[PDB]
Amino acid sequence: NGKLRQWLIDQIDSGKYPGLVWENEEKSIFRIPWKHAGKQDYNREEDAALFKAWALFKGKFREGIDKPDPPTWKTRLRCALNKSNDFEELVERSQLDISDPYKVYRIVPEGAKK
Amino acid sequence: GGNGKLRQWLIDQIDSGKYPGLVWENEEKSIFRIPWKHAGKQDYNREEDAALFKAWALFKGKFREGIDKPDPPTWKTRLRCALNKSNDFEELVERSQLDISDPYKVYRIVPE
Amino acid sequence: GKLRQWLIDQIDSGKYPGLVWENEEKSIFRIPWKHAGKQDYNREEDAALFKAWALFKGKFREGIDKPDPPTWKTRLRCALNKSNDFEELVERSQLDISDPYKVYRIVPE
DNA sequence: AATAAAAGAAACCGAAAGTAA
DNA sequence: TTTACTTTCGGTTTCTTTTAT
């Protein structure tokens, strides 16, 4: 009934967001760019695109109707990632203090029994 | 299965020690205790707690051991509905304990 | 149905400050609705109404159950939503002021 | 120093599934 | 079965305290 799992899998499977790539061929671990908005390498378009995309895809942000607030978009996805049972951050694999920094996440498989 | 069987039958089930938690509260035998546990709770075991409901289903024609598939929720609902509408029984709702372990309801027997 | 009468009764008492009628026909009322994280929020006064609903239904027992104001708030909110006896006037609600509240109109039968 | 972004935790929401009477 | 709430689901928004430039 949720949308985050399928949606994010789709954005990675698309080549739309550079740095949003699978790390393995088994499609279980992926990399998600996570740049601090204050950095010099940061451009609003390319780095905020994934967060804006989630706000567009849910009804939250409507282009031309609403005033843009990019930190809000990032907070939504971060908190959504944290809370979801579908995603587990591999905190020992995240690279946040480099140019082109990223976080590493695992998509949990569904459970065996009921 | 027919009319005028509920009152005496339940009195008989209380006077026997067969159903744990189905005991009299007074010596005048006008008020009694009936376990009323949610089937999902952890303490719930199907045998002991569904026994009274299964017993009513057997005593009336509704359940036949070995011929029909058991449905404990159906037995509970059937006996519940009988108690509410019964002129022979009146719930003392101010003494019932439904949000405790081994929860129960308290009922008063209407004299004629 | 106990909510319709119970809530009408809670408004008619002056017990909960901010739980007041807006009109003289007793069809529309104001129900305080503050976020529990805000600074003005005090646990006793603002959760009192939700606490009262939890008491009046069997859900909370003083001294037997651990207090959970967030669950109290959720139950009352969801109850109002499903109620055919209650309809929120969303064009009147004031959620982003100090002392925020919601506005509800009582459906006549 | 200052301004802006960011962080976890928890309270929060509607919708729907669930439960009881 | 209808009415009437209550609980659960899948994220979302807020609160307060760090972190980045």
Numbering used by the authors:
A (entry chain A): 21 to 134
B (entry chain C): 19 to 130
C (entry chain B): 22 to 130
Q: What does the literature reporting this entry say, word for word?
A:
Taking advantage of the dedicated long-wavelength beamline I23 at Diamond Light Source, data were collected at a wavelength of 2.7552 Å with the aim of solving the structure of the complex de novo using native intrinsic phosphorus and sulfur SAD methods. The final high-multiplicity (∼80) data set to a resolution of 2.6 Å (space group C2221, unit-cell parameters a = 77.9, b = 112.4, c = 140.7 Å) was obtained by merging eight data sets collected from two crystals: four data sets from each crystal. A further advantage of solving the phosphorus substructure was that the DNA double helix was readily recognisable and the electron-density map for the nucleic acid portion of the structure was strong. The phosphorus sites were used as well defined guides for fitting and building the DNA double-helix model, which is important when, as in this case, the DNA departs from the canonical B form.
Deregulation or mutation of DNA-binding proteins, such as transcription factors, is closely associated with the pathogenesis of several human diseases, including cancer, making them attractive therapeutic targets. The structure shows the presence of three molecules of the IRF4 DBD bound to one molecule of DNA, which is unexpected in the light of previous studies suggesting the homodimerization of IRF4 on ISRE elements.
